[PDB]
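Customer ticket, subject: "Can you confirm the structure for Non-structural protein 3?"

Message body: Hello, I'm evaluating your service for our small team and ran a test protein. I'd like someone to confirm that this is what the system normally returns, since I don't have a reference to compare against.
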Amino acid sequence: VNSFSGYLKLTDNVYIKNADIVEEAKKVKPTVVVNAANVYLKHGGGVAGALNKATNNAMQVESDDYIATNGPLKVGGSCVLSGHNLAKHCLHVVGPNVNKGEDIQLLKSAYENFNQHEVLLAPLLSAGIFGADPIHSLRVCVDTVRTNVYLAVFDKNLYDKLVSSFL
Ligand SMILES: Cc1noc(CNC(=O)c2cccc(C(=O)O)c2)n1
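Agent reply: Thanks for trying us out. I re-ran your input and got the following:
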């Protein structure tokens, strides 16, 4: 048993809820929250901007030090950093950005990072301002992630469409 509440069960291991991931992280304080990162860990907008704002910019300060030491992530890659006030850890995962022309096949590689963690609170990778079809992102998630993933979908209209179209 874990502390996640109000989720619809899609599969053995994937759960979904209409929720603000920031508000969900603050309530649950999960072991791992996933950020929809870019390779520079520049948390300007979307999920990343919202998570970073909720940390009072401490996520961005830590991220800048990480990039200064290690250089950029790979598209499809990840790093584990602090979860600050939101979670124990933040798994920064880079899905392909369609609005930059990145290979959508890299979305499966992105979701494979989740398998290194037993339980995660996450957004749909490459959705929102990353430009991919969220229905596709949910299908890749279900077909790739084997660990227990709690998906937060901000937009109520999209949530209802994801549930009602789920195979
Ligand atoms: C802190 C703070 N500052 O502004 C906001 C408003 N919340 C969002 O922007 C938001 C939340 C969850 C997911 C997404 C997304 O883009 O999928 C976006 N929270």
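A couple of notes from the result: Residues 1-167 form one domain. Strands lie at 8-9, 14-18, 32-36, 78-82, 89-93, 119-122, 148-153. Feel free to reply with more questions.
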